[PDB]
Design a protein around this ligand. Structure first.
Ligand code: 16E
Ligand code: 16E
Ligand code: RCO
Ligand code: RCO
Ligand code: RCO
Ligand code: RCO
Ligand code: RCO
Ligand code: RCO
Ligand code: NA
Ligand code: NA
Ligand code: ZN
Ligand code: ZN
Lengths: 21, 29, 29, 21, 28, 21, 28, 21, 29, 21, 28, 21
């Protein structure tokens, strides 16, 4: 999930935007 | 668990700014 | 409006804290 | 929604539970 | 009032940074 | 009160330090 | 070591929300 | 104190309330 | 006044997020 | 300056990117 | 690790408060 | 720089003045 992905290595804004509605 | 807790705090603030008026769901996890 | 944008940042922080393992939905409408 | 309900008058942490999953 | 509520969040963070090891009392 | 004084005008770090222990 | 310093910042913000008008002392 | 307790393990809301006036 | 001051704190957080490892110059002037 | 500009009307992350190094 | 990314967020917030009149230059 | 200087050990607010304009 998002914590596993983005607390392992930095998520870009593009990567974060995948988690938006 | 504290480190993950703190990281998640930062993450949801970033998602807030990226998603804007679209909003988002935050679902641990 | 900017005030609502600033309010939302604080709302997300509070939801993160209150909701714990449940997570939350941020739906500004 | 949460902005209408909570950006003028303060929502307590108990009221904010309404927006948990 | 939400503006006061939100201001207070920033006050407590600034006090945390200023007061250092001394800490502080937050009394609204 | 800090809220009255510092949400009604901007308080410097020096002014805020008064509220420390 | 910075993690206590950074964690403390998050902790006072959480205390502010939890304690409300009751206030709190912050004392490391 | 609160740092030794709550920066070693996550304090819940209820546990934080221990530290309010 | 205070409004601006606190809004600016959020603004620099947003700059930080978008700029990442590049960083940024901030001036209120 | 930027604070007046972005505290009067919302600035998107796209708009802010041009201020990066 | 993401630690330095998260620390930078805290740094900028502190710089905003410390460097009031003239702002700051954040270069990691 | 600031990350080497301040993300390993705590920088005081005086130390952070090094990064003001
Ligand atoms: C909740 O997420 C359950 C998920 C869980 N595990 C993972 O997702 C993977 C492990 C996360 C790595 C955490 C590293 C975060 C580093 C944070 C820095 C700590 C200091 C922060 C100080 C500061 O506030 O800046 C699972 O079970 O999958
Ligand atoms: C969407 O576009 C908003 C539209 C608006 N709908 C509403 O405002 C209704 C939102 C759903 C929740 C209503 C539940 C009503 C029960 C009130 C409980 C009050 C209890 C006090 C404690 C507390 O605040 O939790 C519309 O267009 O109709
Ligand atoms: O990978 C992450 C974690 C937290 C905030 C962020 O912008 C990115
Ligand atoms: O009504 C609100 C608005 C923003 C944050 C919060 O804790 C409550
Ligand atoms: O006057 C204020 C109010 C809130 C934070 C701060 O640094 C100053
Ligand atoms: O144990 C902690 C530490 C920091 C914030 C929080 O909500 C709980
Ligand atoms: O226009 C603004 C002002 C403050 C923060 C932000 O993300 C945008
Ligand atoms: O050393 C640091 C790192 C981040 C914020 C701060 O106030 C000090
Ligand atoms: Na935010
Ligand atoms: Na609506
Ligand atoms: Zn704010
Ligand atoms: Zn942090």
């Amino acid at each position: 999930g998002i914590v596993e992905q983005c607390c392992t290595s930095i998520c870009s804004l593009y990567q974060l935007e995948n988690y938006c509605n | 668990f504290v480190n993950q807790h703190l990281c998640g705090s930062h993450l949801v603030e970033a998602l807030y700014l990226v998603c804007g008026e679209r909003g988002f769901f935050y679902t641990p996890k």
